[PDB]
């Protein structure tokens, strides 16, 4: 049990172990930069905001901790530490997460070669995440962190701009490739310097998307069992598939080709992360022996309806059982 110390930061009391020094805020729960003495690393220490305020906050807290404890991969943010100043369950009310501090995000940050390397990295993390039966669902430049070495990590600017059109429409059975769509949108933005689909709202968003990919065909329409949604696209302006070479003019044709394969309206046809990794565009980085998959992840909690105190107590169990990663 380490020795904690108290400190008020930006109107909030941070109580953290002495191992973490020089706390310094970085934005918004809220996050501090710190120096970690046990490792030598600059780290981010996140103090969760009202973790157990409602069933939904509590379950969300639990979910985030479970996910972070699971992720062990170079291109996904994982957990250096988790702690609470609480001495027991009864007084458990605060959660702090410690992760690697990353320089910047993609929102900040291009050459075709730079783009290859960042998109390759996102796809490699996504392979790993998808292998655990996890869908990120909110990939966007601000959720992708890069250090000065250009090394990229996924973690968790309008969300709507990067969202698969099946989510816009509230399809209940969307698959992992929603994240592939997002990557497509990010990649286009890196290669062109412009938000591919900067919708002002969800109708505008689909309107912009359909201008590029084309109104949907019979093969896709027949998979749609809602006349509501069906009657939309039918009704919505009836345009043809644009030629990506004509839209991404002068870009590497292999990049345009991968873009074609990611930005497919029919998620059953959209390329997977593993597939996109073996695409020619990543010829210079792709190595199928260095593209690992994840241990399986127990998501059964997601279907459970529990009391606040039960989500809380599960979370406390996960704090207590945390095994930090080795030094290397
Ligand atoms: C049964 C209830 C139902 O059909 N629900 C529903 C609602 C909305 C969408 C789908 C659906 N969507 C897609 N993706 C196409 C999205 C889209 C977006 C903008 C314009 C046109 C189309 C699906 C893709 C692939 C399959 N197999 C099913 C899909 N269902 C469903």
UniProtKB/Swiss-Prot annotation:
Localization per Swiss-Prot or TrEMBL: Cytoplasm; Nucleus
> Primary place of residence?
cytoplasm
Modifications the protein undergoes after translation, according to the UniProt entry = Dual phosphorylation can also be mediated by TAB1-mediated autophosphorylation. TCR engagement in T-cells also leads to Tyr-297 phosphorylation by ZAP70. Dephosphorylated and inactivated by DUPS1, DUSP10 and DUSP16. PPM1D also mediates dephosphorylation and inactivation of MAPK14.
* Outcome recorded upon mutating residue 296 to R: In a lung adenocarcinoma sample; somatic mutation
Q: Which cofactor does it need?
A: Mg(2+)
* Outcome after substituting residue 62 to H: Lowered kinase activity
Q: Which domain of life is it from?
A: Eukaryota
The annotated modulation of its activity is: Activated by cell stresses such as DNA damage, heat shock, osmotic shock, anisomycin and sodium arsenite, as well as pro-inflammatory stimuli such as bacterial lipopolysaccharide (LPS) and interleukin-1.
Domain Protein kinase, first and last residues per copy? 20-282
Record: residues binding ATP: 26-31, 46
Please tell me in which tissues this protein is expressed. Answer: Brain, heart, placenta, pancreas and skeletal muscle. Expressed to a lesser extent in lung, liver and kidney.
- Any GO BP annotation: regulation of ossification
What are the Phosphothreonine sites (modified residues) in this protein?
12, 237
Which reactions is this enzyme annotated as catalysing?
Answer: L-seryl-[protein] + ATP = O-phospho-L-seryl-[protein] + ADP + H(+); L-threonyl-[protein] + ATP = O-phospho-L-threonyl-[protein] + ADP + H(+)
Impact of altering residue 47 to R?
Answer: Impairs MAP2K6/MKK6-dependent autophosphorylation
Enzyme Commission numbers on file: 2.7.11.24
Catalytic residues, per the record, are 156
Concerning PROSITE patterns, the annotation shows: MAPK (PS01351), PROTEIN_KINASE_ATP (PS00107), PROTEIN_KINASE_DOM (PS50011)
Record's comment describing the protein's domains: The TXY motif contains the threonine and tyrosine residues whose phosphorylation activates the MAP kinases.
Q: What does this protein do?
A: Serine/threonine kinase which acts as an essential component of the MAP kinase signal transduction pathway. MAPK14 is one of the four p38 MAPKs which play an important role in the cascades of cellular responses evoked by extracellular stimuli such as pro-inflammatory cytokines or physical stress leading to direct activation of transcription factors. Accordingly, p38 MAPKs phosphorylate a broad range of proteins and it has been estimated that they may have approximately 200 to 300 substrates each. (Microbial infection) Activated by phosphorylation by M.tuberculosis EsxA in T-cells leading to inhibition of IFN-gamma production; phosphorylation is apparent within 15 minutes and is inhibited by kinase-specific inhibitors SB203580 and siRNA.
Its assembly, as annotated, is: Component of a signaling complex containing at least AKAP13, PKN1, MAPK14, ZAK and MAP2K3. Within this complex, AKAP13 interacts directly with PKN1, which in turn recruits MAPK14, MAP2K3 and ZAK. Binds to a kinase interaction motif within the protein tyrosine phosphatase, PTPRR. This interaction retains MAPK14 in the cytoplasm and prevents nuclear accumulation. Interacts with SPAG9 and GADD45A. Interacts with CDC25B, CDC25C, DUSP1, DUSP10, DUSP16, NP60, SUPT20H and TAB1. Interacts with casein kinase II subunits CSNK2A1 and CSNK2B. Interacts with PPM1D.
UniProt lists the family membership as follows: Belongs to the protein kinase superfamily. CMGC Ser/Thr protein kinase family. MAP kinase subfamily.
Record's protein name: Mitogen-activated protein kinase 14
Gene name of the encoded protein = MAPK14
């Amino acid at each position: 049990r380490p020795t904690f110390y108290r400190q008020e930061l930006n109107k909030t009391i941070w109580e953290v172990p002495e191992r973490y020094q020089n706390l310094s805020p970085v934005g918004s729960g809220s996050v501090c930069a710190a120096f970690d003495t046990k490792t030598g690393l600059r780290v981010a220490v996140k103090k969760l905001s009202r973790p157990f305020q409602s069933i939904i906050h509590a379950k969300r807290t639990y979910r985030e901790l479970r996910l972070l404890k699971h992720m062990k991969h170079e291109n996904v943010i994982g957990l250096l530490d988790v702690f609470t100043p609480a001495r027991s369950l009864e007084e458990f009310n605060d959660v702090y997460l410690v992760t690697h501090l990353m320089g910047a995000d993609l929102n900040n940050i291009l050459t075709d070669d730079h783009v290859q390397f960042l998109i390759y990295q996102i796809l490699r993390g996504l392979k790993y995440i998808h292998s655990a039966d996890i869908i990120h669902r909110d990939l966007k430049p601000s959720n992708l962190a890069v250090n000065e070495d250009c090394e990229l990590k996924i973690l968790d600017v309008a969300t709507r701009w990067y969202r698969a059109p099946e989510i816009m429409l509230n399809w209940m059975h969307y698959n992992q490739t929603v994240d592939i769509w997002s990557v497509g949108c990010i990649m286009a933005e890196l290669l062109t310097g412009r938000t591919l689909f900067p919708g002002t709202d969800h109708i505008d968003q689909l309107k912009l998307i359909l201008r590029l990919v084309g109104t949907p065909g019979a093969e896709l329409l027949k998979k749609i069992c809602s006349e509501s949604a069906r009657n939309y696209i039918q009704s919505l302006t009836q345009m043809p598939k644009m030629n990506f070479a004509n839209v991404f003019i002068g870009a590497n044709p292999l990049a345009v080709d991968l873009l074609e394969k990611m930005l497919v309206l029919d998620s059953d046809k959209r390329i997977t992360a593993a597939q996109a990794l073996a695409h020619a565009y990543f010829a210079q980085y792709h190595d199928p022996d260095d593209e690992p998959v994840a241990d399986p992840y127990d998501q059964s909690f997601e279907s459970r309806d529990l009391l606040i105190d039960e989500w809380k107590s599960l979370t406390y169990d996960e704090v207590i059982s945390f095994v930090p990663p080795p030094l290397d």
